[PDB]
Write a protein that binds this ligand. Structure first.
Ligand SMILES: Nc1ncnc2c1ncn2[C@@H]1O[C@H](COP(=O)(O)OP(=O)(O)OP(=O)(O)O)[C@@H](O)[C@H]1O
Ligand SMILES: Nc1ncnc2c1ncn2[C@@H]1O[C@H](COP(=O)(O)OP(=O)(O)O)[C@@H](O)[C@H]1O
Ligand SMILES: Nc1ncnc2c1ncn2[C@@H]1O[C@H](COP(=O)(O)OP(=O)(O)O)[C@@H](O)[C@H]1O
Ligand SMILES: [Cl-]
Ligand SMILES: [Cl-]
Ligand SMILES: [Cl-]
Ligand SMILES: [Cl-]
Ligand SMILES: [Cl-]
Ligand SMILES: [Cl-]
Ligand SMILES: [Mg+2]
Ligand SMILES: [Mg+2]
Ligand SMILES: [Mg+2]
Lengths: 22, 53, 483, 469, 41, 469, 128, 128, 28
């Protein structure tokens, strides 16, 4: 998603990708 | 994804308000301590001034 | 027998002598006690004279014969004092014989009026990169050095004094500037190191040191800034130019507070007297730029104020800020980060940024003034690609504002170091490595390229030929630096 | 009558007269002095003794030194001879141009005009500045105040008003250097000769001058404000004509009183000020006003200590003013000059009946969006500009453009800004902000409106910014 | 208590909000200046 | 000559002599008393009367009691015999070991060294503490000042420096118990006998003790600071030895002055303090210095009233110091000891010429990242660590590891802490912090850095945590 | 005069803040003891007795009324200041005015949530 | 009396805050320079001499002791106030008591972090 | 704030476990 301020969801998605939504 | 972020933003903003409330509570105490001291100190200036006349 | 020209001490305590007699004594007149000590008659009362004691007051007993000098409190003045370290009254304290001055000027004379004055024209070169570019001090101006303790307040003043060796050793008479450092409140071990530093840098030969440390009494600390100001007025009136540093006016105010309260005068804000604004204003106002008729000379003031916890809104700070022409806000936050001198560019102003800058300096400083202002608006970030260089440039230019102690640069040399950053030869270079760049660059440019620095001083601007030469000097140096 | 000095402490001096005791507010000529040292009576102590204040340094004074009574207050020269001549608080000239020989004199102390003598003529004065003329316009024949902190642009603002209004004003002017920098007095005197308002070789001078400055004692600085208005009182009363009265700085009147309040024998008031603040200001302020006969249009620069408008000295002055110009540091530090607060500076003439409904609606319309802009700023601090709605983004866009269009480069401040000065008419200001609120400059960037004259220059500057980009 | 209290304080949120607005309108200035290129040419 | 006690109010006593009136500073023996009461002459009130300050309790004084004049100030014993002996404010032995026999006596009052007598050589002093040596290192023959609030850790810090430096140093030492706990005087006395620095039988003692504790009246606490000061002056001037002065606590001198100034008949200053605060401290502090012949390295504990550093007493002391050590409560309550503030404590020898460019760049580097961490506290409070940038997370992570590595177990603290004390050299400290700034220990946890000696033990502590899982 | 003779009346003190400054000046120059913020000890009593005289009479004592509308100037919108808190505690309600509400467009700028009339809610026409 | 004659005694001052207010009344009526919270300069000296007298005597001087347990009343958990900090700087450690822990139900409500005992750790049973 | 510490210490106590989990694996 685009709008921030929502815990650590954007980083949690990035966790599994390295190892939609601007 | 949309259901996860709204639940997180709810709890995140809930924490932001509650953490702000704690800062308000403690700053209200520091405000009132400083409020009294300004009244006390500035009164002592006037009493010291009248004494020296 | 005589009670007209002589008096006896009724009561003595805390450096305040209440003298019976002395009927013909003037206000603000000096008086000599039987022991040998001097004193100033401030309070003239119907049945007593409140005399403040210069120095120790243990020797003064009750019923001591207080003589009259028959003259308003004055100090020695002239070019003889250049080299010597003296106390508030003007006696030598460096152990190099008694100095013999020609004239003696009064301590508390009026400042020159509207007609004798003329607008500030010639520059007062501090030799600091951040100062002369952004906050340029002119001769006749009064520029405040405000800030917290241990933030490089005196550091600015000392490097300004060491910078004048460039001008004073030269042949040109107008470009010379005689310094006057007044030490109010600070301990003797500090002043001993300051005189030692000025002796090492060959600065003392054109400098006067008016000491008034914590061991000395409050009246000496009260009088010392005025004593130093009168020594500067000797130059001011008679053609030559001069510089004075009141370090500091905060500790003078505490002395005046002590001296006033012990005379039974009532307190005001923060226990200070009512006329603490008048105390500093008349001292500062005497710093001015004289016209061609009265002399042509000037006196430039550099007062110092100590803020508690960065509180510029306090009583004594707010008074001096409104008095002085400009001000240099030094901060603790910038000091700890590494930015030394820690001058806040956003807050500090001169109010005469035109005549006080050279035309060569005006080119590079004018653009740097703009770019740094653009940077401080977009600061708290690190992203936009369009203004990526804008965030970089500001960091690159801010690193150039750093400057080590006891090494003031020439006005032509400051143009060279800014030219590299402003034209964009440090953009691809990393922020951490800029101190190493300028250190080697300044040593390189001074050693070999003397004629280029000379031609900027000759032409008085960054010429077409000089601009072309510097273009290839920086690019080749930059390539050698990285690879 | 003779009276000997009994005590001297600071600026305060006590003189004991043998029999003929002088009234309060009377000038006392101190004998045995090189320069003229005049004293003014403040209090009667008792035992045929009076307490005074020195209009100059007290060093050199001896107990038993004779001081003669003039039998009147501080009398000064008033008339056409005062024009183009600087003078002391006591009345003597200080420009090395001989004595000012007026045919008639006047005392600096006098009773204020009565309730029946008051005027009620509210007529607009078109200055030239946009932020002033739109939001808080000055009244012709009225009292104007210029509040501001340390170094926010009070002198630069008032000097522009002297430059703009006094030249257009076919009459007289009076500048008062009350407790400020003497360097500024040197700057103002010579630049007025260049413009030609004060002519040297012939007597056709517009501006009269009274000075004191912060080099002088408190007794001097306390009375120069009274010395200044008394010259303007002549141009109001005797000569039936209009007059301007530029004062800078009128805080130093109230400050100078507190410097000798303790020594007079007074218990100090709040924030270390004298107890006589409202009355000492009141007896001075209400003299500076338009009567039925004449018309003083005063402009008073007011120093605000520590940027604190709640301080007694600036706070009490608000009641005495018709139009106000409240300066701000926060607005100044952004780059907006003149840093006039659009949500603080107000005027009595701001009414749809007085200035017209088009003037009132547009002026309030500017104040509406700028106040709503402050509310959105609190939302932007947590969210950011991205998360806001389309309606809220546009409100900020229009608000930021209005902030910048209120700024204007002055002719007096060419060296500071760099650009040449401007002077915008009345309806150019009204129609300029009306187009911005209506949404006629959404496509143009906010940088174009920063530091320009009329609305046409903003569009003209956008052409240069486009071609450069 | 009152409106616009964040920037009045001048802390972290006060100065970051002033910077956040400056970021937005600098990007929009480039977009709007690009529109002036098309209308002119 | 004899004098009569006219008035007694608290510590202040007034004495009227018929003829032969004593000057200021002179001691006066009160007759008809069991213990030796001493009155130092403060003022001359007039009419052959003098105001005095009593060094002991004023109870039992009748009006009209006889008082003799010694004709000099409070003279005390000074010499090698004062080493290993406890003295009081008036020089008498308070350890019950007979009289302190010496061939010369010194007065407690004396003028400071002149400008010609001052020294210039400032060599570094290696303490052993990490936060000290890196950020605000002390100087040999300087003036060290340990600031702190109520119970932050001044007496622990001063006793650490006595344990480290004063033991292993070829020279004499002095301790001054000015207005603190008498229990601490008892602990210090028996600890020094146990160690060896004080010896009862042999005459080879390093430390010289002087004590006027919080149980004593204000007159004692006002003058006992000068009594211990005068002992160090003998070893500096007449012998030419390296002396170590230890005043705990220096605030009590100024506090004692605040109590008497009320009774001495003065107008009170800011926060109810004496008007003679800077000057009374100035004459005292300036004597404590390194002259051309000898040398004094003074370590002074400084109390901070109500955790307010803007208070007059701790504020004025800052100018008298070469090196500062500001102990914060916020740092102590987190668990970090010694609680030295890294963005407050400073030193004059912190210079690229003296310490070195590698020392200087690493020192400011630690201060930079701590300043960046402190600035972001408002953002972490409301929004949190997740809302911060990824580069700022690394900035915050290292800063907290740097905060914890600045902590150190103490030698004297072993008795209650349990953990063994550390003594980190100068080279190992700078090497350790420079690795953390560059980012050589980012993978290791924060609690590994908490309470360790050098950087090597911090890595070893992390492996112990890994084994426990 | 109107109250005691059966008729009704309105009085407006504009403003009591400036009255306190005048009363302060008078007391301090008479060398009377200074209280808080340099005002004399009975600065509450000054406004209390003044306002208390405003009342509503029964039929037995005429039936008239004197209605008081005092004015106070807050500094930076501080309702809890010394001189305001005195007069707030005297009166039977208050009408708070904000500078924020004025510029937004709310004129008269009356804060609805804070402003109350305790007694006058009953004293109203039933149509309203 | 017990201390000097080879016996042990406990003394409790409940409380020194109320004693300070009593001495402030005396000092303010005496017309002596007031400082922080209008207290006199010798308010530290007031509590210092009292507590110092509580001590542990050696076997030469009887071998007894007097043990002090003074009390201070803070205002909303203001440990850094004037009078509290003075008594903290005199006594050999302290026992802080929280309003949170007491209100929450944890009685006695001793703060574990802030509370310390300096010389009491040595005088403790090995079983504890 | 009091709960300013609550959020920050919760973050680093979790990251301490993650870093110690990486440290124990490398130790083997
Ligand atoms: N640009 C700099 N480079 C290196 N060291 C600096 C610089 N500026 C300041 N310092 C250091 O900071 C220390 C304190 O500076 P300074 O003496 O100017 O303090 P101050 O603000 O005058 O306060 P005080 O009067 O209490 O000393 C000095 O020891 C000096 O070495
Ligand atoms: N209209 C203006 N344009 C640009 N700069 C201004 C303007 N007015 C004031 N300034 C800035 O403020 C300073 C002058 O302010 P000044 O009039 O002395 O304020 P004050 O009278 O409050 O001391 C100068 O340094 C100048 O740069
Ligand atoms: N280096 C240290 N390590 C651990 N605890 C300490 C340290 N220094 C002081 N403390 C704690 O602080 C308490 C008070 O210390 P103290 O030196 O008496 O402070 P102050 O002298 O300011 O009253 C001690 O009981 C001790 O537990
Ligand atoms: Cl001579
Ligand atoms: Cl003077
Ligand atoms: Cl006051
Ligand atoms: Cl003892
Ligand atoms: Cl004293
Ligand atoms: Cl005070
Ligand atoms: Mg300094
Ligand atoms: Mg001005
Ligand atoms: Mg201690």
């Amino acid at each position: 998603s685009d709008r921030g301020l929502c815990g650590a969801i954007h980083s949690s998605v990035a966790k599994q990708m390295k190892s939609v939504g601007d | 994804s949309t259901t996860s972020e709204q639940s997180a933003r709810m709890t995140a903003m809930d924490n932001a308000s509650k953490n702000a409330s704690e800062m308000i509570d403690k700053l209200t105490l520091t405000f009132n301590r400083t409020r009294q001291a300004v009244i006390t100190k500035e009164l002592i200036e006037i009493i010291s001034g009248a004494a020296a006349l | 027998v005589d009670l007209e020209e002589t008096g006896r001490v009724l009561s003595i305590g805390d450096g305040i002598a209440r003298v019976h007699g002395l009927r013909n004594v003037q206000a603000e007149e000096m008086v000599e006690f039987s022991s040998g000590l001097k004193g100033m008659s401030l309070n003239l009362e119907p049945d007593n004279v409140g005399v403040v004691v210069f120095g120790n007051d243990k020797l003064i007993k009750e019923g001591d014969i207080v003589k009259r000098t028959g003259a308003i409190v004055d100090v020695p003045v002239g070019e003889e004092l250049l080299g010597r370290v003296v106390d508030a009254l003007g006696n030598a304290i460096d152990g190099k014989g008694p100095i013999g001055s020609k004239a003696r000027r009064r301590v508390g004379l009026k400042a020159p009026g509207i007609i004798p004055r003329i607008s500030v024209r010639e520059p007062m070169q501090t030799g600091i990169k951040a100062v002369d570019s952004l906050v340029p001090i002119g001769r006749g101006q009064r520029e405040l050095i405000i800030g917290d303790r241990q933030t490089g307040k005196t550091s600015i003043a000392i490097d300004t004094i060491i910078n004048q060796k460039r001008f004073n050793d030269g042949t040109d008479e107008k470009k010379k500037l005689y310094c006057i450092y007044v030490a109010i409140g600070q301990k003797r071990s500090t002043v001993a190191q300051l005189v030692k530093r000025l002796t090492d840098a060959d600065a003392m030969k054109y400098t006067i040191v008016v000491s008034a440390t914590a061991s000395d009494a409050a009246p000496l600390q009260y009088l010392a800034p005025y004593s130093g100001c009168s020594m500067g007025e000797y130059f001011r009136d008679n053609g030559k130019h001069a510089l004075i540093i009141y370090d500091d006016l905060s500790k003078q105010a505490v002395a005046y507070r002590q001296m006033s309260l012990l005379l039974r005068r009532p307190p005001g804000r923060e226990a200070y007297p009512g006329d603490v604004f008048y105390l500093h204003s008349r001292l500062l106002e005497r710093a001015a730029k004289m016209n061609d008729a009265f002399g042509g000379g000037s006196l430039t003031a550099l007062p110092v104020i100590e803020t508690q916890a960065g509180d510029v809104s306090a009583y004594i700070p707010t008074n001096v800020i409104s008095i002085t022409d400009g001000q240099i806000f030094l901060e603790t936050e910038l000091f700890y980060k590494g930015i030394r001198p820690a001058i806040n560019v956003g807050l500090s102003v001169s109010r005469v940024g035109s005549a006080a800058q050279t035309r060569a300096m005006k080119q590079v400083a004018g653009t740097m003034k703009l770019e740094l202002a653009q940077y401080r608006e977009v600061a708290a970030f690190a992203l936009d690609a369009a203004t990526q260089q804008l965030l970089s440039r500001g960091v690159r230019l801010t690193e150039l504002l750093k400057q080590g102690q006891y090494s003031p640069m020439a006005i032509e040399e400051q143009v060279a170091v800014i030219y590299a950053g402003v034209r964009g030869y440090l953009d691809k270079l990393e922020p951490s490595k800029i101190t190493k760049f300028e250190n080697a660059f300044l040593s390189h440019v001074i050693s070999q390229h003397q004629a280029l620095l000379g031609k900027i001083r000759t032409d008085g601007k960054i010429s077409e030929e000089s601009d072309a030469k510097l273009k290839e000097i920086v690019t080749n140096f930059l390539a050698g630096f990285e690879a | 009558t003779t009276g000997r000095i009994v005590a001297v402490i600071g600026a305060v001096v006590d003189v004991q007269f043998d029999e003929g005791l002088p009234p309060i507010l009377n000038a006392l000529e101190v004998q045995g002095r090189e320069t003229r040292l005049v004293l003014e009576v403040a209090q009667h102590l008792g035992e045929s003794t009076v307490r005074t204040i020195a209009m100059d340094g007290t060093e050199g004074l001896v107990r038993g030194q004779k001081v003669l009574d003039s039998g009147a207050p501080i009398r000064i020269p008033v008339g056409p001879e005062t024009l183009g001549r600087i003078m002391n608080v006591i009345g003597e000239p200080i420009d090395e141009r001989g004595p000012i020989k007026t045919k008639q004199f006047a005392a600096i102390h006098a009773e204020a005009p009565e309730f029946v003598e008051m005027s009620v003529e509210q007529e607009i004065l078109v200055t030239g500045i946009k932020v002033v003329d739109l939001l808080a316009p000055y009244a012709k024949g009225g009292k104007i105040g210029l509040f501001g902190g340390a170094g926010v642009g009070k002198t630069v603002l008032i000097m522009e008003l002297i430059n703009n209004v006094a030249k257009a004003h076919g009459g007289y002017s009076v500048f008062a250097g009350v407790g400020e920098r003497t360097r500024e007095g040197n700057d103002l005197y010579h630049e007025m000769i260049e413009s030609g308002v004060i002519n040297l070789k012939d007597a056709t001078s517009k501006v009269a001058l009274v000075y004191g400055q912060m080099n002088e004692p408190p007794g001097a600085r306390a009375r120069v404000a009274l010395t200044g208005l008394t010259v303007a009182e002549y141009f109001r009363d005797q000569e039936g004509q209009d007059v301007l009265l530029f004062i800078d700085n009128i805080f130093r009147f109230t400050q100078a009183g507190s410097e000798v309040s303790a020594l007079l024998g007074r218990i100090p008031s709040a924030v270390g000020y004298q107890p006589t603040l409202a009355t000492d200001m009141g007896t001075m302020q209400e003299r500076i006003t338009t009567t039925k006969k004449g018309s003083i249009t005063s402009v008073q620069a007011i120093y605000v200590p520590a940027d604190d408008l709640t301080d007694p000295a600036p706070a009490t002055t608000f009641a005495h003013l018709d139009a106000t110009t409240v300066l701000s540091r926060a607005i100044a530090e952004l780059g907006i000059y003149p840093a006039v607060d659009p949500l603080d500076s107000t005027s009595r003439i701001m009414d749809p009946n007085i200035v017209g409904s088009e003037h009132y609606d547009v002026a309030r319309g500017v104040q509406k969006i700028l106040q709503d802009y402050k509310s959105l700023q609190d939302i932007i601090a947590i969210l950011g500009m991205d998360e806001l709605s389309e309606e809220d983004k546009l409100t900020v866009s229009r608000a930021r453009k209005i902030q910048r269009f209120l700024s204007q480069p002055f002719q007096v401040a060419e060296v500071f800004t760099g650009h040449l000065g401007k002077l915008v008419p009345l309806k150019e200001t009204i129609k300029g902000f009306q187009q911005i609120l209506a949404g006629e400059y959404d496509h143009l960037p906010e940088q174009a409106f920063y530091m320009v004259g009329p609305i046409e220059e903003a569009v003209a500057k956008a052409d240069k910014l486009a071609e450069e980009h | 208590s009152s409106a616009g209290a964040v920037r009045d304080a001048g802390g972290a949120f006060g100065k970051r909000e002033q910077a956040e607005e400056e970021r937005y309108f600098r990007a929009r200035a480039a977009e709007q200046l690009a529109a002036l290129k098309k209308h002119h040419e």
